[PDB]
Structure formats: C-alpha cells, structure tokens
Scaffold this motif. Structure first.
Motif, PDB file in Angstrom:
ATOM      1  N   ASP A   4      20.843   4.609  40.547  1.00 54.54           N
ATOM      2  CA  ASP A   4      22.176   4.448  40.986  1.00 54.54           C
ATOM      3  C   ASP A   4      22.957   3.673  40.278  1.00 54.54           C
ATOM      4  OD1 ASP A   4      20.856   5.354  43.466  1.00 54.54           O
ATOM      5  OD2 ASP A   4      20.798   3.296  44.074  1.00 54.54           O
ATOM      6  N   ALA A   5      22.720   2.652  39.313  1.00 54.27           N
ATOM      7  CA  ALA A   5      23.694   2.066  38.443  1.00 54.27           C
ATOM      8  C   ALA A   5      23.954   2.783  37.128  1.00 54.27           C
ATOM      9  CB  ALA A   5      22.869   0.760  37.735  1.00 54.27           C
ATOM     10  N   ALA A   6      23.220   3.771  36.833  1.00 52.19           N
ATOM     11  CA  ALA A   6      23.233   4.681  35.766  1.00 52.19           C
ATOM     12  C   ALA A   6      24.321   6.128  36.315  1.00 52.19           C
ATOM     13  CB  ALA A   6      22.020   5.566  35.390  1.00 52.19           C
ATOM     14  N   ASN A  85      23.098  12.128  30.484  1.00 54.21           N
ATOM     15  CA  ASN A  85      22.238  12.467  31.242  1.00 54.21           C
ATOM     16  C   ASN A  85      21.599  11.104  31.726  1.00 54.21           C
ATOM     17  OD1 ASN A  85      19.617  13.481  32.264  1.00 54.21           O
ATOM     18  ND2 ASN A  85      19.641  15.149  30.851  1.00 54.21           N
ATOM     19  N   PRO A  86      21.958  10.761  33.068  1.00 53.30           N
ATOM     20  CA  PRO A  86      21.152   9.508  33.769  1.00 53.30           C
ATOM     21  C   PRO A  86      19.590   9.719  33.626  1.00 53.30           C
ATOM     22  CG  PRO A  86      23.031  10.143  34.628  1.00 53.30           C
ATOM     23  CD  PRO A  86      22.762  11.170  33.707  1.00 53.30           C
ATOM     24  N   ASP A  87      18.985  10.780  33.815  1.00 55.12           N
ATOM     25  CA  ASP A  87      17.624  10.815  33.851  1.00 55.12           C
ATOM     26  C   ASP A  87      16.916  10.394  32.436  1.00 55.12           C
ATOM     27  OD1 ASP A  87      16.406  12.315  36.257  1.00 55.12           O
ATOM     28  OD2 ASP A  87      18.171  13.637  35.666  1.00 55.12           O
ATOM     29  N   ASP A  88      17.570  10.698  31.347  1.00 57.49           N
ATOM     30  CA  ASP A  88      17.205  10.327  30.050  1.00 57.49           C
ATOM     31  C   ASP A  88      17.760   8.914  29.682  1.00 57.49           C
ATOM     32  OD1 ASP A  88      16.248  12.945  29.292  1.00 57.49           O
ATOM     33  OD2 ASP A  88      17.857  13.429  28.382  1.00 57.49           O
ATOM     34  N   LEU A  89      18.792   8.407  30.073  1.00 57.38           N
ATOM     35  CA  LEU A  89      19.140   7.137  30.237  1.00 57.38           C
ATOM     36  C   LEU A  89      18.330   6.365  30.857  1.00 57.38           C
ATOM     37  CD1 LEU A  89      21.088   5.147  28.834  1.00 57.38           C
ATOM     38  CD2 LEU A  89      22.560   5.432  31.363  1.00 57.38           C
ATOM     39  N   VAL A  90      17.922   6.448  32.132  1.00 58.35           N
ATOM     40  CA  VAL A  90      16.966   5.711  32.757  1.00 58.35           C
ATOM     41  C   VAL A  90      15.535   5.584  32.233  1.00 58.35           C
ATOM     42  CG1 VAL A  90      15.423   5.809  34.904  1.00 58.35           C
ATOM     43  CG2 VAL A  90      17.946   6.099  35.198  1.00 58.35           C
ATOM     44  N   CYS A  91      15.024   6.839  31.460  1.00 56.64           N
ATOM     45  CA  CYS A  91      13.496   6.464  31.040  1.00 56.64           C
ATOM     46  C   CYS A  91      13.758   5.660  29.932  1.00 56.64           C
ATOM     47  CB  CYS A  91      12.757   7.682  30.633  1.00 56.64           C
ATOM     48  SG  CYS A  91      13.491   8.978  29.506  1.00 56.64           S
ATOM     49  N   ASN A 132      34.122  -5.147  30.021  1.00 58.92           N
ATOM     50  CA  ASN A 132      34.016  -4.973  31.176  1.00 58.92           C
ATOM     51  C   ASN A 132      33.019  -3.723  31.185  1.00 58.92           C
ATOM     52  OD1 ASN A 132      34.430  -5.885  34.218  1.00 58.92           O
ATOM     53  ND2 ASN A 132      34.423  -3.754  34.251  1.00 58.92           N
ATOM     54  N   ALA A 133      33.491  -2.842  30.545  1.00 54.92           N
ATOM     55  CA  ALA A 133      32.617  -1.441  30.441  1.00 54.92           C
ATOM     56  C   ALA A 133      31.256  -1.770  29.918  1.00 54.92           C
ATOM     57  CB  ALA A 133      33.214  -0.467  29.318  1.00 54.92           C
ATOM     58  N   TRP A 134      31.005  -2.528  28.778  1.00 52.49           N
ATOM     59  CA  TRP A 134      29.856  -2.991  28.524  1.00 52.49           C
ATOM     60  C   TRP A 134      28.831  -3.612  29.359  1.00 52.49           C
ATOM     61  CZ3 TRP A 134      26.818  -1.166  24.324  1.00 52.49           C
ATOM     62  CH2 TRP A 134      27.598  -0.321  23.581  1.00 52.49           C
ATOM     63  N   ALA A 135      29.703  -4.516  30.029  1.00 58.38           N
ATOM     64  CA  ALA A 135      29.007  -5.320  31.133  1.00 58.38           C
ATOM     65  C   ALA A 135      28.323  -4.200  32.218  1.00 58.38           C
ATOM     66  CB  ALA A 135      29.702  -6.431  31.877  1.00 58.38           C
ATOM     67  N   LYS A 136      29.061  -3.103  32.592  1.00 58.77           N
ATOM     68  CA  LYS A 136      28.523  -2.238  33.368  1.00 58.77           C
ATOM     69  C   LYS A 136      27.010  -1.637  32.776  1.00 58.77           C
ATOM     70  CE  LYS A 136      32.738  -1.300  35.645  1.00 58.77           C
ATOM     71  NZ  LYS A 136      33.844  -0.313  35.796  1.00 58.77           N
ATOM     72  N   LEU A 137      27.154  -1.322  31.258  1.00 60.44           N
ATOM     73  CA  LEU A 137      26.011  -0.721  30.779  1.00 60.44           C
ATOM     74  C   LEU A 137      24.821  -1.907  30.915  1.00 60.44           C
ATOM     75  CD1 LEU A 137      24.624   1.531  29.301  1.00 60.44           C
ATOM     76  CD2 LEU A 137      25.650   0.578  27.335  1.00 60.44           C
ATOM     77  N   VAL A 138      25.077  -2.983  30.434  1.00 63.23           N
ATOM     78  CA  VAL A 138      23.966  -4.064  30.640  1.00 63.23           C
ATOM     79  C   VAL A 138      23.463  -4.298  32.044  1.00 63.23           C
ATOM     80  CG1 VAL A 138      23.722  -6.760  30.411  1.00 63.23           C
ATOM     81  CG2 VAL A 138      24.920  -5.166  28.712  1.00 63.23           C
ATOM     82  N   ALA A 139      24.128  -4.035  32.921  1.00 61.84           N
ATOM     83  CA  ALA A 139      23.752  -3.950  34.458  1.00 61.84           C
ATOM     84  C   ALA A 139      22.692  -2.994  34.862  1.00 61.84           C
ATOM     85  CB  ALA A 139      25.045  -3.984  35.436  1.00 61.84           C
TER      86      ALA A 139
END
Ligand code: HEM
Ligand code: HEM
Lengths: 145, 145
Positions: A4-6, A85-91, A132-139
């Motif tokens: 969801d976050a991705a 690709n959220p699926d690759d980012l997540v794994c 703020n954009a980078w804080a979203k990636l850290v999250a």
C-alpha cells in the motif's frame, strides 16, 4: 501493508525522487559518507549500533565506513530503479528490512535518516518538496519494520 | 591478499567486464534469478545455506529469492563501478566478504558461482574470454574470505 505504501508513491513523487537522485546518486562515495556522518553528528545515540565499522569519526579515511556508505547508496539506487514496479520495490524493501530487523532497528529509529537526507539534499539545493518526497520512500521501508 | 588480486584486473580485463556487464546488467531481475537457480541446480549442496529464502525451486515466483537476486546484481554493479579505483573496490569487496564470512562461506564455496556466471554469459553469446574475466573479479572476493 508495504505494498500500500509503495502503491501510493505518485507520478510527481517518483519524478522528484528521480530528479534529485540524478544529482545525489552521481557521487555515491561522497554523498554516502556525508549521509552517515550527518547521522552520527545529529544522532549520536546511533553510533553504538555501528560498532563493526570501527571508529566512525575518521570519515572518508575509515575504509569500513566508506565501504558501508557506498553499499547503502546502491540500496537507494535499487529503490529508485524499482519505482515503477511496486512488486519488485516491495521484495527489495523487505530484504533490506530484514537486515535492520536483525539489528533491532525499529521503524521510528529507521526514520532518523530523514534528517541527514534533508541536509544532503539541501546542500545540492533540493528543498523541502524533495525532502518530503524522500520521506515518503523511507516510509515504505518503515511499513516493513 | 585482496590488493594483489585487485592488481590482476588489467585494462583488457576491465574492458571485458564492462562490455559484458552492459548486456547482463540490463536485466537484473531476470539474469539475477537465472544465476541463482543455475547455482542451485548445478550445486545442490549449497541450497542449505539459503534456508531463509524458503523454497528456491519456485524461482522468480519466490519473492524472497527475487529480492535477494536483484540485490546481488547491484553488488556486481557496484564492483563494476569501482573498477577505476582499487581502494574503493577493495573496501566494498571486504564489506560483502564479511556478509559471507558470517554465513560460513569459504573461498572455495564462493568460487562455485563461476559455473553459473559462465553459463549465463554463454546464453548471451559471451564466451570463455568473458567468463575468465569475470572469474578474475570473483577471485578478488575469494581473496578476502
Ligand atoms: C536510507 C536508509 C537506510 C538504508 C537504505 C540502509 C541500508 C543499509 C544497508 C544496505 C546495510 C547493510 C546490511 C548488511 O550487509 O548487513 C545497512 C546496515 C545497517 N544499518 Fe542501515 N540503512 C538505512 C538507515 C539506517 C538507520 C537510520 C539506522 C539506524 C538508526 C540503520 C542501521 C543499520 C545497522 C546497525 C546496520 C549494520 C551495520 C554493520 O554492522 O555493518 N540503517 N543499512
Ligand atoms: C558473484 C558472487 C556473489 C555475490 C556478489 C554475492 C552477494 C551477496 C549479497 C549482496 C548478499 C546479501 C547480504 C546480506 O544482506 O546479508 C548475499 C547473501 C548470501 N550469499 Fe552471496 N553472493 C555471491 C555468491 C555466493 C555464493 C557462491 C554463495 C554460497 C555457495 C553465497 C552465499 C550467500 C548466503 C548464504 C547469503 C545469505 C542469504 C540470506 O539468507 O539472505 N553467495 N550474497
């Protein structure tokens, strides 16, 4: 979930991440060590976690700190390359999350990196929008911790 | 010693590494998973070391194996990017060496990746010249184990 976050990183958030990474990711040794030394300077309580790297006041001259800082920047490179690709980012997020869960690093403690990121971005004149954009990636990684 | 093994990466070896990496590095997920499944298929005795990834027979479908494989390809990307400076190549080699030393992986067992690398290069029409160049970069990590 991590997914969801991705899945919520938008087209303009990804654009700001890629545009700032073209500059801070071009010198991975310099900017990687700058990130780690700002973490130790502003958050001295974290120094004890990095005991394997030896004496972190040495900065660039500490070979183990320099090796660690370069590899961390390739972890961020990997994130930036998997954005569409959220699926690759997540794994890959989950793999790096396990590296921190074994070191008992909580989601709150992992978020302490946002201060250093904001400062290194600001040195290359990337303001609050980019921070703020980078804080979203850290999250996204925090969602896994 | 790592520094002598690093001195073995001459101008021609560096060129062959960069030229083949331009092709296998374009698909990190695909070639990364290909390398790992070829290692497990040809060297079944090594699968026990990778128990955290679960059922590796699943290949690409196994999310932990895919996350691991993409990150492994960024370690190789990192080595290629450090070829200009042997001091930086040696501190990132030593960082990854410690990741395998803690896993009780010897220089001899790490060497088992050369079979996989030659096969993946061969499917891309990069023959033994390139396989031998890559064996020399693998030998730098072996020297640190
Ligand atoms: C942008 C954020 C971060 C990224 C991408 C990141 C990435 C990494 C990577 C790739 C490693 C190497 C893992 C290994 O080989 O075992 C690592 C190790 C580590 N990280 Fe992070 N990290 C981040 C933030 C943090 C923060 C904020 C803390 C703590 C407050 C932290 C604590 C650690 C510790 C303790 C280690 C192990 C050091 C060692 O003994 O080698 N990390 N990190
Ligand atoms: C081109 C050669 C190789 C490279 C660049 C490489 C790179 C990596 C990287 C980057 C990791 C992740 C480290 C971490 O986060 O803890 C890893 C983990 C691992 N590697 Fe390798 N590796 C290579 C070959 C091998 C071989 C040939 C073996 C064993 C026969 C091996 C055994 C392991 C094991 C056991 C892990 C831990 C997997 C896990 O539980 O997460 N590696 N490797």
């Amino acid at each position: 979930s991590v997914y969801d976050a991705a899945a919520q990183l938008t087209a303009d958030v990804k654009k700001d991440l890629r545009d700032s990474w073209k500059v801070i990711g071009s010198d991975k040794k310099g900017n990687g060590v700058a990130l780690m030394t700002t973490l130790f300077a502003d958050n001295q309580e974290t120094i004890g976690y990095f005991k394997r790297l030896g004496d972190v006041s040495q900065g660039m001259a500490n070979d183990k700190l320099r090796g660690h800082s370069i590899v961390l920047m390739y972890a961020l490179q990997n994130f930036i390359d998997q954005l569409d690709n959220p699926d690759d980012l997540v794994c890959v997020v989950e793999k790096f999350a396990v590296n921190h869960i074994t070191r008992k690093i909580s989601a709150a403690e992992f978020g302490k990196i946002n201060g250093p990121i904001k400062k290194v971005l600001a040195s290359k004149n990337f303001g609050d929008k980019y921070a703020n954009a980078w804080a979203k990636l850290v999250a996204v990684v925090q969602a896994a911790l």
